[PDB]
Amino acid sequence: FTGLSKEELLKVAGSPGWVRTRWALLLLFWLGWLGMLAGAVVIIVRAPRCRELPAQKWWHTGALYRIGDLQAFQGHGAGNLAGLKGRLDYLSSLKVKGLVLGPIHKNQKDDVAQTDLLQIDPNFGSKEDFDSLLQSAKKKSIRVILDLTPNYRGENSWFSTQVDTVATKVKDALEFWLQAGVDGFQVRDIENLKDASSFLAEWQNITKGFSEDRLLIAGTNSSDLQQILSLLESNKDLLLTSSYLSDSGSTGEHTKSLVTQYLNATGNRWCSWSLSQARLLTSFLPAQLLRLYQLMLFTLPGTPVFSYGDEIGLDAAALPGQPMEAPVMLWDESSFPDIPGAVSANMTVKGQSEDPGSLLSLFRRLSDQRSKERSLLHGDFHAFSAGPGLFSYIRHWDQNERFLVVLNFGDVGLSAGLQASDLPASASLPAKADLLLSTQPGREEGSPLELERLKLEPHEGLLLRFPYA
Amino acid sequence: VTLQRNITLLNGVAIIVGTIIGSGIFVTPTGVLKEAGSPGLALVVWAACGVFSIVGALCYAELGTTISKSGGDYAYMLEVYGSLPAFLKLWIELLIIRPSSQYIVALVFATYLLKPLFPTCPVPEEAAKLVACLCVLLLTAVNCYSVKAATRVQDAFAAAKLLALALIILLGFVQIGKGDVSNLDPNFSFEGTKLDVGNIVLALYSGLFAYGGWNYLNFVTEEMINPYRNLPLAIIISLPIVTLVYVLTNLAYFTTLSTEQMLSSEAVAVDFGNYHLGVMSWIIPVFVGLSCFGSVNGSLFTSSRLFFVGSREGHLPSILSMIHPQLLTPVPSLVFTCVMTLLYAFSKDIFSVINFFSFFNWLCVALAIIGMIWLRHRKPELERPIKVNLALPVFFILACLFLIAVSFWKTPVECGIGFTIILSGLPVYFFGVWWKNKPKWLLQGIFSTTVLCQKLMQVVPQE
Ligand SMILES: *[C@@H]1O[C@H](CO)[C@@H](O[C@@H]2O[C@H](CO)[C@@H](O)[C@H](O)[C@H]2NC(C)=O)[C@H](O)[C@H]1NC(C)=O
Ligand SMILES: *[C@@H]1O[C@H](CO)[C@@H](O[C@@H]2O[C@H](CO)[C@@H](O)[C@H](O)[C@H]2NC(C)=O)[C@H](O)[C@H]1NC(C)=O
Ligand SMILES: *[C@@H]1O[C@H](CO)[C@@H](O[C@@H]2O[C@H](CO)[C@@H](O)[C@H](O)[C@H]2NC(C)=O)[C@H](O)[C@H]1NC(C)=O
Ligand SMILES: *[C@@H]1O[C@H](CO)[C@@H](O[C@@H]2O[C@H](CO)[C@@H](O)[C@H](O)[C@H]2NC(C)=O)[C@H](O)[C@H]1NC(C)=O
Ligand SMILES: N[C@@H](Cc1c[nH]c2ccccc12)C(=O)O
């Protein structure tokens, strides 16, 4: 109604110029569309490109879990693998990407001609039991690495006699266990092996000859850096767990120097972070440092290897009955029969579950945060100097979420003292960042924090999270 | 001078198919597995969503057959109730939810089309915005050109979506044929994180996202041949096919990937293509991108004929009613829709619109069903050839009440504010409808503006 009818509109709109105006607007619209397309093309072509993927393997995407004594993992009186088949849910909840069985072959004493590396010990389990355990582990996406140490009941790592026949037995057993379906091998205390470099190179070549996802772990007892480098001279791809970090504890910058020197000497390759080849963390640390080390090991460029029960701070010096080499796992008050009532809830795994502040909750959160971001998976690592008693570094892959870890190894509280951000690389440090979690009571998370006025209580770790700049 | 009926049965099915299957199948699996841990539970909730959509479409078909007036909820819910609720509905459609729908779908299209050029890197935001705006401009020009071109494009892109889904299904079947285990033991058995109200209702709420968009046939009624029989037939042909395709695609996804992979990754289709294809697995997002393109077109179509309908009732300015004498398309309505679709690009954030839509979309359907029941009670034999039993509508009303309760539980503060905006239309309603004897200068200015818009864009009144 509020407008011209058909006849009047066709009478008036036919005037010259009016026909040209709408045509001009149509051509202007098409020109603007073409200009928008050209601008989009220019923005696309003049843009940075992606970084190349590092060809991710299976063992780079999570920690590893070691089981030194299978009998004491589920308590005495139950040594069969069915305990592990039933307990796989616990490790799946922990979200580990590996599992290291202890030695299961026959080893009674130093008798070389009687010890065999292929036959499965009946007490530990059966061959079909091992196959069922492997199948269950594979279904749970938990891959199994099997240990091969011919002598673990006596004094020598391999045998006190000539070791060539030991190498022949090991090379015979490699395929027997490889076609069994295991996903990797482990050898320990190779410091007692004469000319161990050649044997390790041969085993690495053989294991890689079956498939590409096969892995080999070597464990030493020497903290010397030069010996480790000499061992890795011909075994670059080999993962070597050692006591390197065990030399010093609670050191503000000595630990940073150790880590930086090791990374510089190794050529920034992939390595394994652990305080000992087969021993627990509490055997070298007190109860006030477990959180700091568990935070450090989950944010370093490498594979972290932990011992069983060290996600809840198990102690081998708190109960006389349990031997130091084979601690008994604390599942309930009835787990340890001697002196009932000595076991407390806060050391019990069930007591550490519901409590948010428990070590087990911290371990679970770090495990969750380890295997989803690419920065912590295969990102670049840059450590920068800070105030005394502190260790500060940054993780950043190419463009994803950047992480910044600060640890206080000093015995007294002090400010952050971040001073100059040495080697920031592409990931510039902003004045504002998030705080995902803290290792001490207080310090509510989720809120942003200001770094220039960070007050650090003794023995505290921070895992600030900030995005691309 | 009236819009002749051009949509046929095939185009009627194509509209629904291209509107419903735009993005949900390629993203939702991750969320439904996050809520429902067991893949069997996810399949069960998908089937439940499918049958719920079947029930809603069934009754909706009758509701549309009874009232052959053009326009969707704005017509059925205007004939029932009164003028005031209808204007609130149309104002809400005009303000946020409808214009934001096209922009969000176009942004998804841009991102998934530019993904092959930036596999791991996040695509630049400027390029995505420009590509989305280019898509909207091209589509609103094609729509203004002629109806037949729009119908042909919609049919072609629906066919492309079906072809991509069939490719996914055949790849899944092939990988089943290679001695697969179908992940049967994790399937069903332990449910995982099931709860009475904690998780199953959340999984249902996530599932109903991908099944939306079936309420579009009404928006194009009075433009299709023989609406009395072709409208219900198109719905009953389209919906079960979509349900079975969704179920089969979810089954194909679950069997060939680990649960944790979906729980961690986002683009399930990209991972499927990388695993199976292994070669040139970059077109997969491209197809998916195309799967969005046609969708936008459909929405734009179903948007324009909505606003035009409002302009017939006097709620809207009379500029929108006029149509081109030769082309016979409502040019001003399409231009207005394109303008307010473009205007949402300038927003820094775009996910804030879901908070209100999430409950508005599911309360309006319940209001429409209550109106249908009221119409049945008030006067019988109002040309109801179908005459469905009065059992589905009451169950649908009860289910919609549960959905509204779940929405209130999930986002109380967000839902509150969303509804407050609804009250903002009252001053506009009073100024436009309740206020009529305006000063002469206002009427002169309005008339001059409409005359100018008629002079630039050659459009004649409806009659
Ligand atoms: C056996 O393992 C050794 C350990 O590096 C590999 O050394 C190779 O020796 C063979 C011939 O002696 C040649 O392939 C090269 O001289 C060496 N290549 C490399 C990469 O070291 C060897 O690859 C493995 N298998 C072979 C072919 O001997
Ligand atoms: C073996 O582990 C312990 C940890 O300190 C050390 O014991 C030495 O063992 C080697 C080989 O038997 C011998 O030198 C002596 O038995 C011990 N002497 C030393 C060095 O303390 C030793 O650090 C480790 N092995 C070496 C030599 O590094
Ligand atoms: C091990 O790395 C250190 C890094 O400090 C090397 O010491 C030098 O310091 C600069 C600064 O980082 C290094 O980039 C240079 O490579 C070294 N140059 C100087 C000033 O001596 C040390 O030389 C490295 N050792 C090896 C074997 O590369
Ligand atoms: C329980 O946690 C406490 C942490 O304080 C540790 O041992 C406790 O030590 C404090 C004082 O040093 C006292 O509460 C008790 O001596 C111990 N706790 C209790 C409740 O007895 C250790 O982590 C756990 N100790 C025990 C025995 O519960
Ligand atoms: N589900 C549609 C998206 C969609 C279109 N119209 C809708 C109305 C309400 C909710 C979702 C939609 C898709 O797959 O892309």
* Nearest chain A Cα distance for residue B455, angstroms: 6
CB contact under 8 A, A44 and B117: yes
Rg (CA), chain B: 23
CB B225 within 8 Å of CB B5: yes
Ligand 5 binding residues, C-beta < 6 A: B 19, 21-24, 101, 210, 212-213, 295, 361
Nearest to B124 among A2, A13, A43 (CB): A43
B229 closest CA partner among B72, B79, B71, B62: B62
Cα B142 to Cα B156: distance, rounded to the nearest angstrom: 14
Q: Please judge whether B457 and A22 are an interchain contact, meaning their C-beta atoms are less than 8 angstroms apart.
A: yes
What is the spatial distance between Cα B38 and Cα B220, in angstroms, rounded to a whole number?
40
Of B101, B219, B360, the one to substitute when testing ligand 5's pocket (max ligand atoms within 8 A of C-beta) is B101
Which ligand has the shortest distance to the CA of A352? 4
Bridge partners, residue A432, by sequence: A450
Q: Which atom of ligand 4 is nearest to the CA of A287?
A: 23
CB atoms within 10 A of CB A133: 21
For A316, the token pair is: 């081998």
The Cα–Cα gap between B335 and B341 comes to 10
CB B284 within 8 A of CB B59: no
Q: What is the DSSP letter of B430?
A: I
Q: How far apart are CA B104 and CA B341, in angstroms?
A: 10
Secondary structure of residue A100 in the 3-state scheme: strand
Q: Are residues A2 and B124, on separate chains, in Cβ contact within 8 Å?
A: no
Number of the ligand closest to the Cα of A238: 1
CA distances from residue B407 to B57, B202, B403 in whole angstroms, order as listed: 22, 9, 6
Considering only CB atoms, B450 lies closest to which of A3, A48, A399, namely A3
Show contacts of B78-84: CB within 8 Å, 24+ apart: B78/B313, B79/B371, B79/B375, B80/B371, B80/B372, B80/B374, B80/B375, B81/B367, B81/B371, B83/B313, B83/B315, B83/B433, B84/B429
Alpha-carbon distance A229 to A336, whole Å?
Answer: 43
| Neighbouring residues of A243: CB distance < 8 A, sequence distance ≥ 6 | A220, A221, A222, A223, A275, A276, A277
Angle, in degrees to the nearest 10, between helices B9-20 and B227-256: 40
Longest dimension (CA), chain A: 116
Which of 3-42 (A) contact B at CB < 8 A? 3-6, 9-10, 12-13, 18, 21-22, 25, 29, 33, 36-37, 39-40
Rounded Cα distance, A415 and A429, in Å: 18
**Which residue is closest in CA terms to ligand 5's atom 8?**
B213
Provide residues of B within 8 Å CB-CB of chain A. 1, 114, 117-122, 124, 126-127, 130-131, 133-134, 137-138, 141, 185, 258, 260, 264, 317-319, 322, 325, 446-447, 450-451, 454-458, 460-461
Nearest CA to ligand 2 atom 28: A222
Longest CA–CA separation in chain B, Å: 81
Which of A 213-252 lie inside 8 A of B, CB atoms?
none
**B442 burial class (0-12, 13-18, 19+ CB within 10 angstroms)?**
exposed
What six digits make up the tokens of B226? 């023989």
User: Tokens 């708190």 identify what position?
Assistant: A318
Could you tell me whether strands A402-408 and A455-456 are parallel, antiparallel, or unpaired per DSSP bridges? unpaired
Asked if A13's CB is within 8 angstroms of B458's CB, the reply is: yes
Query: Quick one: which ligand is closest to A222's CA?
Result: 2
* Facing B454 at nearest CB: one of A9, A40, A48: A9
Helices (H) and strands (E) in chain A, counts: 12, 16
Under DSSP, is residue B241 helix (H, G, I), strand (E, B) or coil? helix
Query: Which DSSP category does B94 fall into?
Result: I
Residue nearest to atom 6 of ligand 5 (CA): B213
Is the CB of A5 less than 8 angstroms away from the CB of B322?
no
CA atoms within 13 A on the CB side of A444: 1
Residue A117: both structure tokens together: 């590396």
Cross-chain Cβ contact A21/B456 below 8 Å: yes
Which residue has the least CA distance to atom 1 on ligand 5?
B210
Q: Are B94 and B307 in contact (CB under 8 A)?
A: yes
**What sections of B117-195 are H helices per DSSP?**
125-145, 147-177
Write the DSSP symbol of residue A69: -
Q: CA of A40: which chain B residue's CA is closest?
A: B127
CB A240 within 8 A of CB A229: no
Distance of CA A121 to the CA centre of its chain: 31
- B122–A399 CB contact, under 8 Å: yes
Quick one: which of A397, A368, A384 has its CA closest to A424? A384
8 Å CB contact between A150 and A105: yes
Residue A108 to residue B339: CA distance in whole angstroms: 85
- With an 8 Å Cβ cutoff, are A4 and B258 in contact? no
**Rounded distance from Cα A385 to ligand 3 centre (Å):** 16
Nearest to A36 among B130, B446, B456 (CB): B130
Cα(B75) to ligand 2 centroid in Å equals 89
Contact status, residue A337 vs residue A77, Cβ threshold 8 Å: no
The neighbouring-strand residues paired with A414 are A456
Please give the Cα distance from A187 to A312 (Å, whole number): 26
CB pairs under 8 A between A and B: 81
Which chain B residue has its CA at the smallest distance from A44's CA? Answer: B127
Residue A20: in which H helix or E strand, if any?
Answer: helix A18-45
Distance A190 CA to ligand 1 centre (A): 22
Q: How many angstroms is it from B18 CA to the middle of ligand 5?
A: 10
Q: What resolution in Å is listed for this PDB structure?
A: 3.6
**Nearest atom (ligand 4) to Cα of A313:** 23
Answer whether B165's CB lies under 8 Å from B245's CB: yes
How many whole angstroms from B213 Cα to the centroid of ligand 5?
5
Distance from the Cα of B319 to chain A's closest Cα (Å) equals 8
Residues whose CB is less than 8 angstroms from the CB of residue B316 and which lie 6 or more positions away in sequence, other chains included: B90, B307, B310
Beta carbons within 10 angstroms of residue A300's beta carbon: 18
- Say if the Cβ atoms of A141 and B124 lie within 8 Å: no
Q: How far apart are CA A322 and CA A338, in angstroms?
A: 9
Cβ atoms B264, B249 nearer than 8 A: no
Nearest to A176 by CA among A127, A225, A217: A127
E strand or H helix at A306: strand A302-307
Sheet (strand A99-100) strand order: A239-241, A216-219, A185-188, A144-147, A99-100, A64-66, A302-307, A271-273
CA geometry: angle at B374 spanning B372 and B380, to 5°?
85
- For chain A, the first-to-last Cα distance in angstroms comes to 57
